[PDB]
C-alpha cells in the first residue's frame, strides 16, 4: 500500500484550480485534495486542445463554461507591423500596397503528393505567377477573420479550428466552484506560514498562519512567480533566459469597446512597438491589452505613454497594471515530492499564447508520470524532460519572431539580430531556405487534435513555421527541388488553392459575425 493518499496545492489562481479540478476528476475518492490560497483582467488566449484535454475531461461543454468567463473565440494570432518601421500604433502600416499584417491560424495544411500546400505556394511565388501572401493563399480562415466572422454557425455547426479568449480570474472562480462543489476539493483560505520537511527534504505538510497543518504526500506549487515551494523551500534554481528573449516588463489594462461599430475581432493581435510588442485580446464589450517591453531598451514611463498613446488613453486617469516578468524555467519542474505548475514552473511572454497550454500540458504529463510514495526517480526525470523540451522548443520559436523580423529601426529590433541563435533554429531556417518542410504533420487533424500526445510530439508544425517565416517576409531560396521533377503534381495541386478561395467566399458570405455568436452565447 504505497499509493498517494493526500495532495496539497499552494495557490488558487488559474493554475491552482485547473490542477485541483483535473486531479480530483482523475483520482476520485482515492485521494484527498486540499488547496491553500491567500488585478485588472487583461485577457488571456488559449490553443484548441484546451477543450479536448481539459474541459471535456471535466465534462464541461463550452455552452456552460464560456458564459461564466465572458469567453470569446480565437481563430489565430494576427501580427501587425512586424516588417515596417515606425511608431507603436494599432493600425497596420502599408508595405507593397498591402497592410503589414499576417495571420498564424490553427489547423493543419493540406497536402498534395504528400507535399504541404505551403510548398506549392512557394513554388508559385518563385515562378512569378502569383504575389499573394502565404497566409491568404493557404488559409481559408484569413477571409473570415477580416470579416470578423465567428468560427462556427449559430447552431453549433463548426467551420474553422479555434480556441478562446477569456478573463483568467473568471475561469479560476468557475473552476473553484466546480472543484469544491462537485469534486470534493477542500478550499483553505489562508496564508502559508512555513513548509514542514522531513529528514530527506521531502515536504510533509504546509502550515497556515492559523496554525493548521495541511498534511500531504504530494505538493503542487501553483504560487506564481513566487515559487514558494519549488524555489524557496526546495531551493531549486531558476534558469534566467532573458539573454535570449529581451522583454521583461508589461503595462496592461482593459478597455471598454463598442462592439456594434466594427464587431469583435476573433483573434489575438500582437502589435509591434518600438521596444517590444502589444497584445490585444478581444471579448464581448471590452478587450484586454498590454505592452510587453524590455527594460534594457525602454523606460517605464515611455512604455506607459507609448501604450496609452496607441489606444488614445489619458495616462493620468487610466488604471494600469505594471508587472515585471521572470523569463525562463526552473532547472527541474519536479523536485522530490514538489511539482511546480504554471508561473511557478516557467514563463514566456504571451506572444504565442503558451501560458494556459503550459499548465494543461504539465497537468497532463503529471498524470502520465504520477508517482506513489516511493517517488521513483524515473517518473520525475521523465516528467522534467518533457516539460523542459516543451518550454525550450517554444522559447526558441518565440525568439525566431524577433530574429527573423527585418526591422532594425530601433535599438530593440536591432539588438534582437545580435543575439545568439540556437543551432536547432539555425538548422530549421537553413532547411526552410532550401525548400524543405519543417516538422511536417503526418496525421490528419482528427488524430492531431484528438490525441494530446500526438500534438505534444509535434506542437509547432510546418504550417506554423511558414506562417511566421513567410509572414515576416522570409522565403526559401528556391522551391523544393523534387517539385521540378513532378510538374503534373504541381498542376494538380492548384485545385487546392481554388478550394481555399471557394471556402474563403463561403465563410465570409454564410458565417455569422463573432459579435452575433457571442451575444447568442452570453
Ligand atoms: N498545437 C497548436 C499549435 C499552434 C498552431 N497555431 C498556433 C497559434 C498560436 Cl497563438 C498558438 C499555438 C498554435 C495548434 O495547432 O492548435
Author numbering: 2 to 39, 44 to 527
Original paper wording:
Flavin-dependent halogenases (FDHs) regioselectively halogenate aromatic substrates using halide ions, O2, and reduced flavin (FADH2) at physiological temperatures in aqueous solution, making them a green alternative to conventional synthetic methods for aryl halide preparation. To better understand mechanistic details that limit FDH catalytic efficiency and potentially hinder their application as in vitro biocatalysts, we investigated the halogenation activity, substrate scope, crystal structures, and ligand binding of the Trp-5-halogenase AbeH and the Trp-6-halogenase BorH. HOCl generation occurs >10 Å away from where the Trp (or other aromatic substrate) binds, and the HOCl must diffuse through a tunnel toward a conserved Lys,29 which either hydrogen bonds with HOCl and positions the Cl for reaction with Trp by EAS25,30,31 or reacts with HOCl to form a chloramine, which in turn transfers Cl to Trp by EAS. Our results show that flavin cosubstrate/coproduct (FADH2/FAD) and substrate (Trp) cannot bind simultaneously to either AbeH or BorH.
All structures were crystallized as apo-BorH in the same crystal form we previously used to solve the BorH/Trp complex23 (space group P21 with four BorH molecules in the ASU, packed as two dimers A/D and B/C with the same dimer interface seen in the AbeH structures), and soaked with substrates/products before cryoprotection, freezing, and data collection. Though Trp alone or 6-Cl-Trp alone could be successfully soaked into the substrate binding site of all four chains of monoclinic apo-BorH crystals, crystals simultaneously soaked in both FAD and Trp resulted in a structure in which FAD and Trp partitioned into different chains in the asymmetric unit, producing two BorH/Trp binary complexes and two BorH/FAD binary complexes. The Cl– of the 6-Cl-Trp is approximately 3 Å from Nε of the catalytic Lys79. In chains without Trp or 6-Cl-Trp bound (BorH/FAD + BorH/Trp chains C, D, apo-BorH chains A–D), the density is weaker for the substrate binding lid (α14-α15, Val447-Glu460), suggesting that region becomes more highly ordered in the presence of substrate. There are no significant backbone differences among the 16 chains of the four BorH crystal structures, with Cα rmsd values ranging from 0.15–0.47 Å.
